[PDB]
Ligand binder design. Sequence first.
Ligand SMILES: OC[C@H]1O[C@@H](O)[C@H](O)[C@@H](O)[C@@H]1O
Ligand SMILES: OC[C@H]1O[C@@H](O)[C@H](O)[C@@H](O)[C@@H]1O
Ligand SMILES: OC[C@H]1O[C@@H](O)[C@H](O)[C@@H](O)[C@@H]1O
Ligand SMILES: [Ca+2]
Ligand SMILES: [Ca+2]
Ligand SMILES: [Ca+2]
Lengths: 136, 136, 136
Amino acid sequence: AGILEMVARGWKYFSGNFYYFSRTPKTWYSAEQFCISRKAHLTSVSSESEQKFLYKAADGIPHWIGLTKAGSEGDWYWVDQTSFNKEQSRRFWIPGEPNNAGNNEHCANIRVSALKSWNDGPCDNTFLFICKRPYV
Amino acid sequence: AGILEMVARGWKYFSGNFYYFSRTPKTWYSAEQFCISRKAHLTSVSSESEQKFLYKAADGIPHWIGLTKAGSEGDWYWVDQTSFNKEQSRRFWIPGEPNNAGNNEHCANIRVSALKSWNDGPCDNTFLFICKRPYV
Amino acid sequence: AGILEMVARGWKYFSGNFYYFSRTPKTWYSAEQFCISRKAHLTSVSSESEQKFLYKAADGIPHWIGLTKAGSEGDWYWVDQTSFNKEQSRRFWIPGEPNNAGNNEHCANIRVSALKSWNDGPCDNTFLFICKRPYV
Ligand SMILES: OC[C@H]1O[C@@H](O)[C@H](O)[C@@H](O)[C@@H]1O
Ligand SMILES: OC[C@H]1O[C@@H](O)[C@H](O)[C@@H](O)[C@@H]1O
Ligand SMILES: OC[C@H]1O[C@@H](O)[C@H](O)[C@@H](O)[C@@H]1O
Ligand SMILES: [Ca+2]
Ligand SMILES: [Ca+2]
Ligand SMILES: [Ca+2]
């Protein structure tokens, strides 16, 4: 269905995508499994515009997003398979991040309500999360 | 008011009805009293289409619906007074349900995010709940 | 942006204003600081119509509104700077209120889901809150 139908089912809408901001917290993988069941994936962030929408909408509560490493010693990528713009990302990480604390932080969340808000954390940490699916 | 006004007050909309998914948990009766104050009743489920909308929207959190027995030794009915389709219902109960545990389970909730998701429980159990009112 | 865009970002809409009903509780000042960051202020209540919308939408959970005293021994005013109609207000206070308990209740909240629902409380009490911003 369309914008009205999705918005009237609880989805947010912004720049050609719908977003589901979860009620309850999950691990990164359990979140992604839930998003898949809603025909979605944990959100990518493919513009500063989208970053601004998302950090504002997350209300200062940490939220898992769809950035994860390709294995525990791998490079970051978006689980929805859109291209990961490394250089753009420096504008979105909290100062000092990603810092791979304990060598065990392989997923990312929007930690605070700021443009510089991404932190890497243990994927088994439980947070609210953001699903994204395209407006088609 | 209309769809936009109801959606912009927090109501969901689907197939000619509005739905209010509660913030906080109540007993079955306290939920129904709240729904009445919002010109609604605890939701009926009168199609597989509606069941699908509701279990999806309930996000895997148990939610009271408007099915209750006519007294503690009575037959199931919908509190909004729409006809209860016994045979259709077998498609919506969790396997084993209704099981009338302790002979004291006289109200029903959508317990999980599946098509087979209804469980009978004690009406004094406190859960989130779903109000329904027609789009007129 | 317009009604659809605001509603699709979580804002409620009623009689020419948008409203943000918070996820988490804050002190009165921390709430107001958050509302300002969302181009809003803690809500004023400038009609019985608006009072009805707000108490209904607050779902029986106490919510901070934008009424505060001009200093701890001052008169009530709306932080968004709309005129405070003293005489109208008597229709909206809970019976007995405002009672300035402990001589330390200098902010107001909608405490219950009724037309007579405002209570003065300590501004350092933590409640959910309501931001308002005009539809322009
Ligand atoms: O909460 C303590 C935090 O320290 C930060 O600087 C790290 O980057 C986080 O991953 C860690 O959670
Ligand atoms: O949580 C224990 C549960 O056992 C189930 O099989 C019953 O049908 C429920 O009513 C009960 O709550
Ligand atoms: O909860 C106890 C309450 O007593 C009321 O009558 C006061 O007006 C409140 O400000 C106070 O919180
Ligand atoms: Ca980190
Ligand atoms: Ca049962
Ligand atoms: Ca008081």
